[PDB]
Amino acid sequence: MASMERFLSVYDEVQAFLLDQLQSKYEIDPNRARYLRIMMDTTCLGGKYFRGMTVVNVAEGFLAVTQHDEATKERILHDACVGGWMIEFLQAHYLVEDDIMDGSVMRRGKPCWYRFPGVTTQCAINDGIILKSWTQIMAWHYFADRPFLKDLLCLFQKVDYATAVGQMYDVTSMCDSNKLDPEVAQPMTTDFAEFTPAIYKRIVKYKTTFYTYLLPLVMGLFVSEAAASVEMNLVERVAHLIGEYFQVQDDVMDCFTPPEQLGKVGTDIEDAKCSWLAVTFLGKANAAQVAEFKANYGDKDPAKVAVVKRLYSEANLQADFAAYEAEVVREVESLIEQLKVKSPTFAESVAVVWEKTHKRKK
Amino acid sequence: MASMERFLSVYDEVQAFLLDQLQSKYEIDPNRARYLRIMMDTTCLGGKYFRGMTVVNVAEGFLAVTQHDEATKERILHDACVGGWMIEFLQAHYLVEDDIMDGSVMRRGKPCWYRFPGVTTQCAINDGIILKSWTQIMAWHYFADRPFLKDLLCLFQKVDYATAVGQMYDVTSMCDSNKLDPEVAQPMTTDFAEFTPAIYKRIVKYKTTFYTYLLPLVMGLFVSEAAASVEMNLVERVAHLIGEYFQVQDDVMDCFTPPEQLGKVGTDIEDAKCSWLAVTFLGKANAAQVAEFKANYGDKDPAKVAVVKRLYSEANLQADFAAYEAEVVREVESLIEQLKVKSPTFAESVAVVWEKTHKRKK
Numbered sequence: 095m096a097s098m099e100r101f102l103s104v105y106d107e108v109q110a111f112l113l114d115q116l117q118s119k120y121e122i123d124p125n126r127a128r129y130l131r132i133m134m135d136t137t138c139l140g141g142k143y144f145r146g147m148t149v150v151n152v153a154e155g156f157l158a159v160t161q162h163d164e165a166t167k168e169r170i171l172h173d174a175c176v177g178g179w180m181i182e183f184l185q186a187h188y189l190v191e192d193d194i195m196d197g198s199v200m201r202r203g204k205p206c207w208y209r210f211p212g213v214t215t216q217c218a219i220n221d222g223i224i225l226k227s228w229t230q231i232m233a234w235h236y237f238a239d240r241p242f243l244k245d246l247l248c249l250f251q252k253v254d255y256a257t258a259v260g261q262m263y264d265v266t267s268m269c270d271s272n273k274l275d276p277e278v279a280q281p282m283t284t285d286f287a288e289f290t291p292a293i294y295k296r297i298v299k300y301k302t303t304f305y306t307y308l309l310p311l312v313m314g315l316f317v318s319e320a321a322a323s324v325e326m327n328l329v330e331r332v333a334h335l336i337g338e339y340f341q342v343q344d345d346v347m348d349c350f351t352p353p354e355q356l357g358k359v360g361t362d363i364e365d366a367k368c369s370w371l372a373v374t375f376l377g378k379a380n381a382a383q384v385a386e387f388k389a390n391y392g393d394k395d396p397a398k399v400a401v402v403k404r405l406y407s408e409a410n411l412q413a414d415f416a417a418y419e420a421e422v423v424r425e426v427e428s429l430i431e432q433l434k435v436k437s438p439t440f441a442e443s444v445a446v447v448w449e450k451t452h453k454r455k456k
Numbered sequence: 457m458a459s460m461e462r463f464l465s466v467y468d469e470v471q472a473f474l475l476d477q478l479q480s481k482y483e484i485d486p487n488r489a490r491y492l493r494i495m496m497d498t499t500c501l502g503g504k505y506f507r508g509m510t511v512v513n514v515a516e517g518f519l520a521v522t523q524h525d526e527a528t529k530e531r532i533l534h535d536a537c538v539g540g541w542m543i544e545f546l547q548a549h550y551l552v553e554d555d556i557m558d559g560s561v562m563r564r565g566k567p568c569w570y571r572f573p574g575v576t577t578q579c580a581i582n583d584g585i586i587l588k589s590w591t592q593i594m595a596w597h598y599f600a601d602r603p604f605l606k607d608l609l610c611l612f613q614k615v616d617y618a619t620a621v622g623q624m625y626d627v628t629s630m631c632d633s634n635k636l637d638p639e640v641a642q643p644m645t646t647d648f649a650e651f652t653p654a655i656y657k658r659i660v661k662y663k664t665t666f667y668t669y670l671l672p673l674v675m676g677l678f679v680s681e682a683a684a685s686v687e688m689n690l691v692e693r694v695a696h697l698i699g700e701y702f703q704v705q706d707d708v709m710d711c712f713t714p715p716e717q718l719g720k721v722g723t724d725i726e727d728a729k730c731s732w733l734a735v736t737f738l739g740k741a742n743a744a745q746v747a748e749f750k751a752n753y754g755d756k757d758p759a760k761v762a763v764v765k766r767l768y769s770e771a772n773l774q775a776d777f778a779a780y781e782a783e784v785v786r787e788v789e790s791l792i793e794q795l796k797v798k799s800p801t802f803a804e805s806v807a808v809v810w811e812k813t814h815k816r817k818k
């Protein structure tokens with residue numbers, strides 16, 4: 095509501111500072127400033143801002159149940175917005191490199207940045223790297239003399255690294271561990287032995303949950319100086335859980351949601367990704383169903399994709415997702431309940447985060 | 457050399473720390489731990505270690521004239537090495553992405569990281585990103601209670617951003633600035649109107665000088681708690697001057713130093729880089745020489761590349777270089793003299809940095 099407007103207003107402020115500074119300190123010319131402005135806008139906007147708005151929400155929750163002088167209310171909320179944009183830009187960074195890494199065509203209804211007619215792949219790689227650097231400029235500039243600066247940055251470091259590590263689990267999830275070797279070329283897996291719930295869970299824990307859930311939540315606490323007033327173990331546990339469900343949704347939608355609605359084009363089947371559908375399929379498939387899977391998965395051929403998708407339809411995975419959903423709903427409620435004990439209001443924020451995640455169709 | 461091996465010993469400490477942390481905190485498996493170990497070795501080792509050793513030298517220079525407890529001596533020298541390695545991992549990061557962006561084949565006598573038989577481009581982009589995250593994991597781990605932690609991290613960020621911006625100038629140095637529009641396909645320059653000394657200076661200042669000279673020198677002062685005893689404006693001026701000269705050498709070597717000596721294969725001509733040779737050549741070429749250049753520059757064909765090299769030879773470009781060097785000598789020497797005023801030992805450290813840079817053959 096008033097929350098979204100404030101968040102969006104801050105972007106313009108952040109962008110102005112960044113681009114103005116490129117002029118006065120970095121000798122940028124008008125056309126390259128425009129290039130980076132459009133880059134920023136394309137890769138940072140048009141998402142649903144779940145991450146960014148979570149830190150705002152968490153911050154709002156503590157303001158509402160307490161009393162603050164108007165000045166201190168604005169500092170915190172502005173800080174929450176800047177923090178949120180740090181996260182949004184960090185995802186921008188990830189999505190840029192990820193689309194290149196996954197050979198994707200579309201993101202958020204437009205071409206992937208690296209596929210923009212005037213954008214070279216080589217430049218896109220560096221653009222992505224600029225996006226992450228931007229998070230650091232904005233933290234030092236806006237949070238210069240904040241008590242939480244050191245904790246915020248340290249946490250940002252840890253989360254970004256966990257995500258880089260997860261991306262390598264993800265991007266190497268179709269290879270055989272025992273044949274993984276920089277010196278020797280290696281084909282994708284034939285046995286699919288490493289398509290297990292445990293291995294799947296580990297990829298997702300790192301590539302997704304830390305920066306999508308833990309960071310927005312804990313960052314919200316940081317700007318409020320309210321970390322102490324929650325059971326951090328619970329925050330961690332609820333972030334990993336909602337985070338995992340989030341990625342399961344993403345994996346399902348990759349296959350089943352029309353691009354016209356999703357805003358992106360699926361590549362999981364073609365890239366031989368250890369997705370939730372593939373693992374769950376191998377969890378229930380008979381001998382003939384497995385054999386057909388192995389002969390068709392991980393190949394660009396549009397016909398072979400249809401054989402996998404057909405197999406996915408026949409195995410009632412759509413319904414296995416419901417049984418997973420139901421299970422997750424129980425666990426989330428359980429953790430929300432446990433969060434109410436020390437912080438009834440943060441638990442409400444987590445409830446909101448959950449409902450948004452639960453109800454999304456992207 | 458003894459100090460070299462002492463420096464390398466800290467690399468083993470850092471590696472062992474990173475890798476052990478991946479096992480105990482990141483659920484890494486032995487095989488991926490191996491992969492990342494070899495990635496680290498290939499990307500971080502085999503260079504001259506100029507950047508890393510420079511921070512060791514700076515610190516050694518202050519220790520010789522200052523009063524410290526022996527424990528404090530050991531700490532400063534260990535910090536020096538760790539900081540040196542932060543910088544070497546930062547270059548590792550830049551070199552991995554840069555070799556992808558420039559389409560290069562060889563780095564430090566071996567294939568570029570992305571050209572390793574079992575590496576692939578998509579995980580190489582991420583490996584590169586991992587390298588930079590390591591610099592931050594290092595900083596936070598080894599420097600946690602250090603008074604210079606905030607200054608070091610803040611300088612590191614700015615330097616990193618500077619470089620990223622510089623890579624953006626570099627990678628778009630062959631487009632007409634007016635044609636720079638992400639919406640519209642990007643044809644290479646035909647007039648070469650932007651191959652001017654001032655435009656060349658801008659690229660180099662940002663892509664090279666900050667991370668190659670400024671960062672290690674100031675790093676040496678931070679870990680030493682010796683920043684107050686230098687004129688920082690002098691440090692900046694000398695860093696940018698020696699840094700530019702360093703890059704000039706690199707551009708010359710790209711074309712003239714045989715790959716067996718250089719440890720890398722030149723791509724500047726192929727990529728249509730705004731290199732020193734191109735800028736200098738275009739600044740003295742006659743009408744026919746310009747024409748033939750325009751007809752052959754920026755193409756992969758080895759016969760084309762040969763003509764540009766043939767043209768460069770006839771243009772007597774080693775004579776422009778000797779004239780550039782002779783003046784750089786004057787100016788560097790003048791800055792070293794000025795540094796002696798507040799800091800004779802730092803001045804001497806800059807003379808050593810310069811000496812090594814001046815007669816490097818790769």
Ligand SMILES: C=C(C)CCOP(=O)(O)OP(=O)(O)O
Pocket residue numbers: 140141142143144185202302306340341344456
């Ligand atoms: C972490 C994942 C699964 C990438 C997609 O994130 P979103 O679908 O939340 O992307 P936007 O809201 O930013 O578009």
Ligand SMILES: C=C(C)CCOP(=O)(O)OP(=O)(O)O
Pocket residue numbers: 502503504505506547564664702703706818
């Ligand atoms: C080539 C440039 C200008 C980047 C630095 O490379 P170096 O020449 O310092 O490479 P290593 O010593 O790290 O191999």
Ligand SMILES: CCCNCC(P(=O)(O)O)P(=O)(O)O
Pocket residue numbers: 188189192196198257261264301302344348
């Ligand atoms: C950590 C990077 C997040 N990646 C999410 C993507 P993926 O499913 O993990 O490749 P996408 O489905 O949005 O392209």
Ligand SMILES: CCCNCC(P(=O)(O)O)P(=O)(O)O
Pocket residue numbers: 550551554555558560619623626663664706710
């Ligand atoms: C950060 C940019 C430094 N890269 C140096 C390279 P370039 O000449 O700038 O591409 P190389 O010649 O070592 O490949």
Ligand SMILES: [Mg+2]
Pocket residue numbers: 192193196198
């Ligand atoms: Mg993807």
Ligand SMILES: [Mg+2]
Pocket residue numbers: 192196264
């Ligand atoms: Mg991906």
Ligand SMILES: [Mg+2]
Pocket residue numbers: 344345348
């Ligand atoms: Mg996906």
Ligand SMILES: [Mg+2]
Pocket residue numbers: 554555558560
């Ligand atoms: Mg290069």
Ligand SMILES: [Mg+2]
Pocket residue numbers: 554558626
């Ligand atoms: Mg380059």
Ligand SMILES: [Mg+2]
Pocket residue numbers: 706707710
């Ligand atoms: Mg070069």
